[PDB]
Design a binder for this molecule. Structure first.
Ligand code: MTN
Ligand code: CL
Ligand code: CL
Ligand code: CL
Length: 164
């Protein structure tokens, strides 16, 4: 198991424009196109992201290319962020994947806002971090995914993903 397989499970794969859990236009493996209500604005972002006239449909190769770029960007965003980098540096390889997962889903700014949870993770207080992470809109809006990510932080294993 690794970060790519992990996010593929959490995000799924769809080759036509769709609305994510928040109702935002998205495509591929959780690639957010726009927060704008307009399907035309989304198709225009998609064409720009892909580099051709897509008409809202992409191939699997194209979805996987956006995915590679998105995972890379999330990692580089953690490493350049002053609140995230020290947490990331403190963690083992499995829990690092959990942090990347959160950043991929909510962005660098959102995760940097979990000030108290980040401090507990850095201190390696795993049960206490898990309880604090669950006191969040994130957990309340997407409970099954949040539970998988939180269990990964708690245990340092891939158990929440292995029967999937
Ligand atoms: S978040 C810690 C916690 C409190 C209580 C309601 C007693 N629980 O069942 C858990 C362990 C979730
Ligand atoms: Cl998704
Ligand atoms: Cl892009
Ligand atoms: Cl969920």
């Amino acid at each position: 198991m690794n970060i790519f397989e992990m996010l593929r499970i959490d995000e799924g794969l769809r080759l036509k424009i769709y609305k994510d859990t928040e109702g935002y236009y998205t495509i591929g493996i959780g690639h957010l196109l726009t927060k704008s209500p307009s399907l035309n604005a989304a198709k225009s972002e998609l064409d720009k992201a892909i580099g051709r006239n897509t008409n809202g449909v992409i191939t699997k190769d194209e979805a996987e290319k956006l995915f590679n770029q998105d995972v890379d960007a999330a990692v580089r965003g953690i490493l350049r962020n002053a609140k995230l980098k020290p947490v990331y540096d403190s963690l083992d390889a499995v829990r690092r994947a959990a942090l990347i997962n959160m950043v991929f889903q909510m962005g660098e700014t959102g995760v940097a806002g979990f000030t108290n949870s980040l401090r507990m993770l850095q201190q390696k207080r795993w049960d206490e971090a898990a309880c604090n992470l669950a006191k969040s809109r994130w957990y309340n809006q997407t409970p099954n995914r949040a539970k998988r990510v939180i269990t990964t932080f708690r245990t340092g294993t891939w158990d929440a993903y292995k029967n999937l």
